[PDB]
Write a protein that binds this ligand. Structure first.
Ligand code: SF4
Ligand code: SF4
Ligand code: SF4
Lengths: 111, 57, 212, 184, 148, 392, 335, 66
């Protein structure tokens, strides 16, 4: 069936990826953060969300396998990816062909 | 005649859709003047070319 | 810190050098893409009649070159025409993923920009389609006039001509994959394809048809 | 048989012949189309393009907010207890959230807010639609005063009798404001 | 005409504040922000009606007030000033940036000259205010346009 | 990879749906050629409209309402302002009553002109699609004159009447259009009634009898093509539609051919109500009414409680009074109704939209019982369906 | 590398022949809806066939997920090679012929039979359910309109005493317009013209899915350069079928003495430099004046008839066009 | 194929005349002139495709006499 949750920064699928063609499983969840490259990442914050991704799968490992629950995880990752930006950890990309700044504008801290 | 922000003008020229409406001027600019028409319900202001507008006493 | 939501500095130098000929053969690349971009025939809410009026006679759609193709494989442009809810949210990112790689979404209407009148209190509207797909040209108005949608295509043709031929490596998506194993209990699907011949319509149930 | 297929086919071999000359006679007609970047169509007198603002007229009373469908117009005001009146300092209407319903321009006694005619406002970034109080107070774009538009008129603004705005050398709207002031 | 060389790059470094008169259907404006951008100049295409008073937006930090929509308070987002913020990001191995303003025909005449007298007082920074329409794209300095 | 089995093949109609009535999803299943089951998956355009209405005043809600039946427009504003004007007893001036009838009959002409475009493309002829939107832009520019938008988002109906009176060259500009368009209603009738291929696509296709079409809950030209002759303008004596003579078009056959000729004769009958309402407008045209307010400016037969566009311009803090309601308006697709129950504050407690296109849709699985694949869209188009009214 | 001069001069007029028929589609079909057509590119739309095809090259021709790889790519290459090989028949001009094959209106019907395999190995390989339903339907439409089209050529080969396409158009060159084959075969020409229109034109084809019996046809999962072969390879057959109408029935390169007044679709004066080049290229290409009347007809006939469904599309080829194709052949014989 | 004598009569000098003819009488031409207009484009198309990006049919800027 391939239940999934496709937001802009988060693509949580229900199944493991075998060279592009995703096969739907019952055990695993694939996640790739920023398929479009809007935020320029680094070495640390690509490992920081694994402290939130593997937390949210483990903490919510008692509920059903619905796309309402794959969305309810993904709405917490994309609220952790924003908390990286408001802590100034990562930054927007500037090689990107679009420049809409979807997670708020750059602003200074306290005027 | 010079049109100051607050005079009551009306269009005179016949080759324009806003043909004889009168309204209050607002926000004169470097070469253009805008006239708040107040037509019926929603008051719509259209610019004009600082001429063609006979004021009303 | 110093700046909330900071901008990452470009450490790559962008050595985008060429001669006159390769920028003459880049003018042919950029002209042939802006002049014939084919829209997907997408429409959800009220701002499809505003865009379907542009296909017709009083405003010609196929005058800038826009022939509407009703499948995401042939088309490249997609005008986000109407409200996207929580359903039709993954049916639109599926419509965006299945397009050839120079896509150029434009937004349209106040509901795909911010969720116009459904920003204050609606329990299922994705407020703005930039939460789902990258938009090239925004377009407010409720609905936009069919003279104003052809304005946003005019702004979009200014965006295709900026595009460089050797910067085509960012036109392909990236792979930052991870994998975690869950312990969720799987459920059977709800909507199987039976409505009439379901064995719940043919007869009233017992213990309720007595007083019927 | 051999005496039917040349007579059971002329029943529709001549219906296309009276369908071909009908469609071929649509090519003789004049193409009714309004080319946008060269013949912009003049909007109506009541068309609601975008909002115009006057900074020294809105005394911070927020009836622009209380009749807004979504409580949009951001009124930043201090109480200003030194001169015994409340005065604002900012007024921002987020376009993109702004449907053009114009309830602010209806429920106002002091005639501050007002609608312009421009509609070709289609940017590259949504945060460039947050029009400031001096960015809403700019001049409208009038489609007549542009030396590339040949601005054709709308229906219900042509003279009575003609249903096209293309080949119209003169004329006006089909009624008068005051013909009957000196007559009756 | 058809084959454009690199005269638009040297005309912008000479005058400092250009004024493009492009056909009003677009598409042929942007072939000159590519020769500009191939020669190291970065380009920040803003919107001309969206910019408020250009003293408070380009060189000063401005409070962008978000849409509270009745379910928030009156927030103030103090964005950094655009020209000094987008110049500190760009390393000095490249040249400056330009402000390719689109729909520039709705700026007042005072704000044209402020975009003219700021590109000299600011080093390695230019503006290309696209204004008006014509049958063929042609340019001229903003110094001649405000006196026209 | 695909295999060729002997089971009934189930195909998904897709929510992409390249048509002009919105986004459905039909999991229809095939048995070679005749379909055997079909479930509609709707709700793709549910923006939460009954939850909005509990937190809005009335004058904040009239911009929201012309999005349910967004083909029509001000058929939905008529029901919303008729929820407290029929409950608080606010009297409507009779010139506004005849002004509403002109707008509601201009919408029904523009309603049937949006159904007819995609429907004739579904059953055959593809080139009259572009000659029909050309007839729709004349109704748009008439709405653009009086109201400030084309087809939706025109805050024109108020609780005390109508928003503002017409323009100057307006009544003589219907008389150009609504005496040019009426030769073309008789033109679209000859596409389907003649040419014996299109009647070989509509005779017996999607049939329903009278007693099941009343039992399933149907209104408008799905009910009247089942031989019922129930029209809510004649039944509920609603807003001076009883001051005119006109007929209710019935075709008692039931098939999809019966729904074409009702929806053609409701265009032609709407032009008759326009010509009698322009001639019966109590102050005449507005360019002649404001003159008579100038020559006799103290107090005349004019400047009455009628001969004006609104009774009293109401306050924005207008409390909907306490008591239930159900207000019926025969829309262009059926009967549209809201169920208002309000507390004495400025918000209602509940606003149950009864969509005219919701309850016409549930017969589509029953109509698609043994029908072929080639006439699936000719059933789906002939309900005058608009997703946005269904899904709300 | 194509050192034959006639073989390059034919490959250009088979390439510019497409861009005529693409541009003529977007201006005739925009005339009959009272709109402009594609302006703003070229002068008035002349670069709309160039720019629509040039953007198809610059797109990512990506595959679907689980698809056959060698038959996806070979899908369009079987539809378009035999309709490009069969331009070797058409002898436009008195002083021009690429190859005088001793048959060739039988080689054209032979090569046009391979195209149902190209719609089969593309409908199968794209690998969703709505392209097998659309591929098996598109293959079963070139099947039914092929026997009527091959019997229209049987009759005009009886009169011509051969299959050589020069010897056919030489039998109509003795009386100018009196001996065109349309006047002697008025019922075998409509059998040619309805069947040829039902194998390449856009009225009896399920690719615009406004009827929704399938999703978007068999070319649904195709993109990019592969889609350009299904799109700019459909007008290659519209031109060739319209050429062979104006070769078989209407006389190719045949017309009476041009010495007439100014009303001969030309300028004003008698002996100008403008009519000498409107004659000499007409003394090189006379058929593409005639061949761009049926391309003008087939575009105009698209908006004339309604979209006939596939249930009645194969109730036309088998049940009507084939029995009329038989009795035309006997009437062209003695009986 | 002629090298440069008869080729330039087809490719360049006569299609440059049609582009003057295409600009002047295209929208104001009659029902008979329009069908002849489509024939010269479908015949001189490899000539008219060469001088395609040199001529622009954009309308002349107005004078704003009001
Ligand atoms: S903002 Fe209004 S007009 Fe625009 S798509 Fe949404 S509902 Fe329709
Ligand atoms: S509605 Fe008018 S009076 Fe009230 S706050 Fe707004 S501008 Fe001021
Ligand atoms: S335009 Fe409409 S939505 Fe926007 S502030 Fe004014 S009344 Fe509110």
């Amino acid at each position: 069936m391939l239940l999934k949750s496709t937001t802009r920064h988060v693509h949580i699928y229900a199944g493991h990826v075998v060279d592009g063609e995703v096969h739907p499983d019952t055990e695993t969840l694939t996640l790739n953060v920023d398929p479009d490259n809007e935020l320029e990442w680094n070495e640390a914050a690509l490992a920081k969300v694994e402290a939130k991704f593997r937390e949210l799968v483990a903490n919510a490992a008692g509920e059903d396998l619905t796309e309402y629950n794959l969305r309810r995880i993904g709405s917490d990752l994309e609220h952790f990816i924003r908390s990286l930006l408001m802590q100034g950890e990562i930054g927007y990309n500037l090689n990107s062909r679009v420049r809409n700044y979807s997670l708020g504008i750059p602003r200074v801290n306290h005027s | 005649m010079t049109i100051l922000p607050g005079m009551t003008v009306k269009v005179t020229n016949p080759n324009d859709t806003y043909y004889q409406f009168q309204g209050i001027v607002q926000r004169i600019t470097d070469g253009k003047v805008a006239v708040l028409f107040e037509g019926g319900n929603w008051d719509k202001l259209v610019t004009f070319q600082a001429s063609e507008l006979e004021p009303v006493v | 810190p110093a700046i909330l939501n900071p901008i990452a500095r470009p450490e790559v130098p962008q050595e985008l050098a060429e001669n006159i000929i390769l920028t003459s053969l880049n003018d042919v690349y950029d002209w042939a893409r802006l002049s014939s971009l084919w829209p997907l025939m997408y429409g959800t809410a009220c701002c499809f009649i505003e865009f379907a009026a542009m296909i017709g006679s009083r405003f010609d759609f196929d005058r800038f070159g826009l022939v509407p193709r009703n499948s995401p494989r042939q088309a490249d442009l997609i005008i986000t025409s109407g409200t996207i809810t929580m359903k039709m949210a993954p049916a639109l990112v599926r419509l965006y993923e299945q397009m050839p790689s120079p896509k150029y979404v434009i937004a349209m209407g106040a509901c795909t920009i911010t969720g116009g009148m459904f920003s204050s209190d609606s329990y299922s509207a994705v407020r703005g389609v930039d939460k789902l797909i990258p938009v090239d040209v925004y377009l407010p108005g409720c609905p936009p006039r069919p003279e104003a949608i052809m304005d946003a295509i005019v702004k979009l043709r200014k965006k295709i001509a900026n595009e460089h031929i050797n910067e085509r490596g960012n036109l392909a998506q990236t792979h930052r994959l991870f994998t975690a194993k869950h312990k969720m209990k799987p459920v059977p699907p709800i909507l199987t394809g039976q409505y009439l011949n379901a064995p719940s319509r043919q007869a009233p149930p017992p213990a309720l048809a007595a007083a019927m | 048989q051999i005496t039917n297929y040349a007579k059971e086919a002329v029943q529709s071999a001549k219906y296309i012949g009276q369908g071909l000359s009908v469609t071929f006679d649509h090519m003789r007609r004049r193409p009714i189309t309004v080319q946008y970047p060269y013949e912009k169509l003049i909007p109506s007198e009541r068309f609601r393009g975008r909002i115009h603002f006057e900074f020294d007229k809105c005394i911070a009373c927020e009836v622009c907010v209380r009749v807004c469908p979504i409580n949009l117009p951001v009124v930043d005001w201090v109480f200003n207890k030194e001169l015994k009146k409340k005065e604002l300092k900012h007024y921002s209407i987020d376009f993109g959230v702004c449907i053009f319903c114009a309830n602010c321009v209806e429920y106002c006694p002091t005639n501050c807010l007002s609608v312009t005619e421009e509609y070709e406002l289609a940017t590259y970034d949504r945060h460039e639609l947050n029009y400031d109080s001096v960015a809403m107070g700019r001049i409208p774009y009038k489609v007549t005063q542009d030396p590339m538009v040949t601005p054709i008129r709308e229906f219900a603004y042509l003279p009575a009798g003609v249903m096209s705005g293309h080949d119209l050398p003169a004329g006006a709207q089909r009624a008068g404001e005051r013909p009957e002031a000196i007559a009756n | 005409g058809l084959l454009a060389g690199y005269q638009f790059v040297k005309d912008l470094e000479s005058a400092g504040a250009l004024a493009l008169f492009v056909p009003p259907e677009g598409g042929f404006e942007g072939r000159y922000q590519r020769r500009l951008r191939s020669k190291g100049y970065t380009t920040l295409p803003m919107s001309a009606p969206g910019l408020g008073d250009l003293a408070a937006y380009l060189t000063q930090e401005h409070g962008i007030r978000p849409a509270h929509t009745g379910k928030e308070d009156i927030r103030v987002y103090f964005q950094p000033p655009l020209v000094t913020y987008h110049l500190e990001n760009l390393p000095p191995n490249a040249k400056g940036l330009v402000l390719w303003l689109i729909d520039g025909k709705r700026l007042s005449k005072q704000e044209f000259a402020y975009l003219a007298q700021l590109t000299q007082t600011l080093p390695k920074f230019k503006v290309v205010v696209e204004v008006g329409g014509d049958r063929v794209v042609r340019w001229e300095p903003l110094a001649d346009w405000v006196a026209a | 990879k695909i295999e060729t089995r002997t089971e009934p093949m189930v195909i998904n109609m897709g929510p992409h749906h390249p048509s002009m009535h919105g986004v459905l999803r039909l999991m229809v299943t095939l048995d070679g050629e005749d379909v055997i089951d079909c479930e509609p998956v709707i709700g793709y355009l549910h923006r939460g409209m009954e939850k909005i209405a509990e937190n809005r005043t009335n004058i904040m809600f009239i911009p929201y309402v012309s999005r349910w039946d967004y083909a029509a427009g001000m058929f939905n504003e008529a029901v919303t302002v008729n929820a407290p004007e029929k409950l608080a007893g606010i009297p409507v001036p009779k010139r506004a009553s005849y002004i509403r009838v002109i707008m509601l009959e201009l919408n029904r002409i523009a309603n049937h002109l949006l159904w007819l475009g995609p429907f004739l493309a579904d059953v055959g002829a593809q080139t009259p699609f572009f000659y029909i939107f050309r007839e729709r832009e004349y109704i748009y520019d008439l709405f653009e004159a009086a109201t400030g938008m084309r087809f939706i988002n025109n805050n024109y109906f108020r609780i005390g009447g109508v928003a503002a009176d017409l323009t100057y060259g307006w009544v003589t500009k219907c008389r150009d259009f609504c005496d040019y368009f009426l030769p073309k209603v008789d033109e679209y009738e000859r596409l389907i009634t003649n040419n014996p291929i299109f009647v070989r696509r509509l005779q017996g296709v999607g049939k329903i009898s009278r007693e099941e079409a009343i039992n399933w809950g149907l209104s408008g030209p799905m009910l009247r093509a089942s031989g019922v002759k129930w029209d809510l303008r004649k039944v509920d004596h609603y807003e001076c539609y009883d001051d005119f003579d006109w007929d209710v078009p019935v075709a008692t056959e039931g098939d999809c051919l019966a729904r074409y000729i009702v929806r053609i004769q409701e265009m032609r009958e709407s032009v008759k109500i326009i010509r009698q309402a322009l001639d019966g407008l109590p102050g005449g045209p507005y360019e002649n009414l404001e003159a008579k307010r100038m020559l006799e400016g103290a107090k005349s037969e004019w400047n009455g409680f009628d001969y004006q566009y609104i009774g009293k311009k109401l306050s924005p803090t207008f409390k909907i009074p306490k008591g239930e309601h159900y207000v019926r308006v025969e829309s262009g697709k059926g009967e549209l109704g809201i169920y208002l129950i309000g507390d004495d504050n400025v918000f209602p407690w509940r606003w149950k939209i009864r969509p005219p296109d919701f309850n016409n849709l549930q017969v589509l699985p029953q109509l698609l019982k043994g029908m072929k694949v080639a006439d699936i869209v000719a059933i789906l188009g002939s309900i005058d369906v608009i997703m946005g009214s269904v899904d709300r | 590398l194509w050192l034959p001069l006639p073989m390059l001069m034919m490959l250009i007029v088979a390439t510019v022949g497409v861009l005529v028929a693409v541009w003529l589609e977007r201006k005739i079909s925009a005339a009959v809806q009272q709109r402009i057509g594609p302006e703003y590119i070229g002068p008035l739309g002349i670069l709309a066939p160039l720019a629509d095809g040039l953007k198809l090259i610059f797109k990512e021709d990506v595959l679907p997920a689980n698809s056959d790889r060698w038959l996806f790519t070979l899908g369009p290459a079987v539809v378009v090679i035999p309709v490009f090989l069969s331009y070797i028949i058409v002898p436009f001009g008195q002083n021009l012929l690429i190859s005088n094959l001793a048959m060739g209106v039988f080689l054209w019907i032979a090569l046009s039979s391979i195209a149902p395999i190209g719609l089969l190995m593309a409908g199968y390989a794209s690998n969703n359910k709505y392209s097998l339903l659309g591929g098996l339907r598109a293959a079963a439409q070139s099947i039914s309109y092929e026997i009527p089209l091959a019997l229209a050529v049987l009759a005009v080969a009886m009169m011509s005493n051969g299959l050589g396409t020069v010897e056919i158009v030489e039998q109509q060159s003795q009386y100018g317009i009196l001996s065109w084959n349309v006047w002697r075969q008025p019922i075998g020409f409509l059998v040619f013209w309805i069947a040829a229109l039902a194998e390449c034109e856009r009225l009896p084809f399920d690719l615009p899915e406004a009827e929704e019996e399938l999703v978007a046809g068999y070319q649904t999962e195709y993109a990019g350069m592969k889609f350009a072969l299904f799109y700019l390879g459909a007008y290659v057959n519209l031109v060739l079928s319209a050429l062979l109408v104006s070769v078989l029935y209407f006389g190719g390169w045949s017309f009476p003495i041009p010495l007439e007044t100014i009303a001969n679709l030309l300028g004003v004066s008698e002996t100008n430099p403008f009519l000498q080049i409107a004659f000499a290229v007409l003394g090189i290409t006379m058929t593409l004046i005639k061949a761009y009347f049926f391309v003008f007809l087939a575009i105009l006939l698209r908006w004339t008839v309604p979209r006939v469904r596939i249930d009645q599309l194969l109730d036309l080829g088998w049940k009507f066009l084939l029995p009329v194709g038989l009795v035309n052949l006997l009437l062209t014989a003695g009986l | 194929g002629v090298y440069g004598a008869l080729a330039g009569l087809y490719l360049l000098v006569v299609p440059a005349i049609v582009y003057a003819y295409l600009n002047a009488r295209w929208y104001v031409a009659s029902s008979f002139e329009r069908a002849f207009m489509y024939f010269l484009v479908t015949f001189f198309f490899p000539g008219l495709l060469l001088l395609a990006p040199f001529i622009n049919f954009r309308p002349q800027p107005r004078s704003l006499n009001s």
